[PDB]
UniProtKB/Swiss-Prot annotation:
This is Alpha-conotoxin ImI. It comes from the Eukaryota. The modification Cysteine amide is found at C12. GO terms for molecular function: acetylcholine receptor inhibitor activity; ion channel regulator activity; toxin activity. The cysteine framework is I (CC-C-C). Alpha4/3 pattern. The chain holds residues 5 to 16 of 17 of the full protein. Keywords: Acetylcholine receptor inhibiting toxin, Amidation, Cleavage on pair of basic residues, Disulfide bond, Ion channel impairing toxin, Neurotoxin, Postsynaptic neurotoxin, Secreted, Toxin. The lineage of its organism: Eukaryota, Metazoa, Spiralia, Lophotrochozoa, Mollusca. One of its GO terms (cellular component) is host cell postsynaptic membrane. The record marks D5, P6, R7, A9, W10 as: Important for binding to human alpha-7 nAChR. This toxin is a substrate for a multienzyme complex that regulates its folding and assembly. This complex is composed of protein-disulfide isomerase (PDI), peptidyl-prolyl cis-trans isomerase (PPI) and immunoglobulin-binding protein (BiP). PDI catalyzes the oxidation and reduction of disulfide bonds. Oxidative folding rates are further increased in the presence of PPI with the maximum effect observed in the presence of both enzymes. In contrast, BiP is only observed to assist folding in the presence of microsomes, suggesting that additional cofactors are involved. Negative results: does not inhibit alpha-2-beta-2, alpha-4-beta-2, alpha-2-beta-4, alpha-3-beta-4, and alpha-4-beta-4 subunits. Also has no effect on muscle nAChRs alpha-1-beta-1-delta-epsilon. Belongs to the conotoxin A superfamily. It comes from Conus imperialis (Imperial cone). It is found in: Secreted. Coiled coil: none annotated. Changing D5L: Reduction of toxicity.
Length: 12
């Protein structure tokens, strides 16, 4: 999950 994974979570 984007919002879960820190490397994606910033985009969320």
């Amino acid at each position: 999950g984007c919002c879960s994974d820190p490397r994606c979570a910033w985009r969320c």
